[PDB]
Amino acid sequence: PEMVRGQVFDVGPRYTNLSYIGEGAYGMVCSAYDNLNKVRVAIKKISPFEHQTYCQRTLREIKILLRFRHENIIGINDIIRAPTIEQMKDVYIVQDLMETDLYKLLKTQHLSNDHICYFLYQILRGLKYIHSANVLHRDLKPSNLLLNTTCDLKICDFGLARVADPGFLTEYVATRWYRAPEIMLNSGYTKSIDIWSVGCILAEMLSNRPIFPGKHYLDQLNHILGILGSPSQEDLNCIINLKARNYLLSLPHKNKVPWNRLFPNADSKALDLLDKMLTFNPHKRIEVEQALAHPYLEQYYDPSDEPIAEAPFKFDMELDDLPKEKLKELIFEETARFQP
């Protein structure tokens, strides 16, 4: 079996010609050639079985991705794992090859307004489908937006996703920069948190820098307040947790920084939409369908070509309590359909 950067990829004979793309906490992704369909693919090696949370996130990702079918959401084409549960130490997820992601792209080049508009459209088109399935992604960020050379965009990594149907994000080790204010104020389960993240992504496309790069929960909140200014009394009155409300009330007043000052080269319609996504009050924050219908995206908006899920997504089990041995059993069962 071919080795990549000191890791054995047992994907042959079907998959060969492997080269490193990126890596996470418990996985590495590579470009590869599929000798059967004569096409270039991406293969993700996942080794989660010694860690309960890795198992949970892996199971969630697999279940969601196998159920979802949308042009702007990464699919799973094949899964490679061992014929027996004891032998299974690694899982290989085969997906469509996406050459890069928005994180890497923004590190290397400034985007034209045309690209920003088209990318935003696809993000929101994908998100419309996710939300129509009653799923919250919860971890939208540039590195979770996969891109190819022809400007197709696919949302990935549903490891932290949840169904909005009655888990705290502040209990996970993850980038906090794209998190809605209500999350730090200790509240984390409306569709509106995803819209905030998209707003943060838009801001990042406009300037090539994260708008709110907080280092901890209080810093994250303070970064947001630095730009939006202190919330109005009206918006304070909508914060249900009194401690959080009184904390915000107590801070020295901060004036809003106007968006056109932060982003002096941005399209004015783009900043209008940005404002509506980066709205402090989650009830007043724009919804995904309303965002798609915004004048900035008029070039692409077409509700008859923006499909929805035909049924709400549901987890058949509570995963958060399960020991990693049981989670492994469930991963084994879920991947069985790809076995001969």
């Binding site: 050459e99 792209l105 034209s112 891109l147 050379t149 022809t150 400007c151």
Partner: peptide
């Protein structure tokens, strides 16, 4: 759609 991306 906008033109292709030169990826580095």
């Amino acid at each position: 759609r906008p033109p292709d991306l030169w990826i580095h």
